[PDB]
Design a protein around this ligand. Sequence first.
Ligand code: ZN
Ligand code: ZN
Lengths: 48, 114
Amino acid sequence: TVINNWLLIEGHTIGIGDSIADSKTYQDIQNTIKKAKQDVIEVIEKAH
Amino acid sequence: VGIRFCQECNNMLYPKEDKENRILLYACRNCDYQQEADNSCIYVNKITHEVDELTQIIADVSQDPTLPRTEDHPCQKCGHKEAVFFQSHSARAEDAMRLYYVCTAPHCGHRWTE
Ligand SMILES: [Zn+2]
Ligand SMILES: [Zn+2]
């Protein structure tokens, strides 16, 4: 009861803003993914 | 290693021992036909089964649009730049991820492995 009625004051939500990261973070993630794909390509070529 | 067929009833031949001359013979069991044996071997069993896949690879495979192709590896016969490559394409191939290359361009049909 008391916590719900305090949440009536503070409030909680979810939305687009909660799912969006900084552009630097997106660039870092893309760099990591590209590096991973390059490593997988290298492994495939080594197996070839 | 292979089998040879009878020359009279066109049946299957079987190995038969010649007691007198001690020479290997293939004698059909459905008639009296007998022929001399040249290879002198009967049963060959390759447990490792290391048969070169290049013989089992068909030249027309190069016609496949779904197959990857590379410009890096040229043909050895005609030196054609374009070549199509694919993996073993077979089961029970032990552990082998090696690539088999087939040269494109008509009438070449060359297959090599690197
Ligand atoms: Zn026969
Ligand atoms: Zn060629």
